[PDB]
Amino acid sequence: GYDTPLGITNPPIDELLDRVSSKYALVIYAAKRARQINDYYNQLGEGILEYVGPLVEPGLQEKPLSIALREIHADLLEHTEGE
């Protein structure tokens, strides 16, 4: 119940934290996927499709980190926590 967020505040932080144990885990859970998406874009020209690209269809020039956060909020990824 609120106005639609605009900017780097979308998706809302509370919904993201509802999935991850804590924000310290969420930052890594997002950054590693951003790195994966960036690597996929880098190897888009030619290479083995070992790193699957973005799951949710990206927008017009959306940064990889934003795509990672959106696809995390959409409940399409699963992560395992070390120790």
């Binding site: 799951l55 990824l77 699963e78």
Partner: peptide, 9 residues
């Protein structure tokens, strides 16, 4: 997740 990969393409 495996479902997302299966439905990706």
């Amino acid at each position: 997740t495996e479902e997302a990969r299966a439905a990706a393409y």
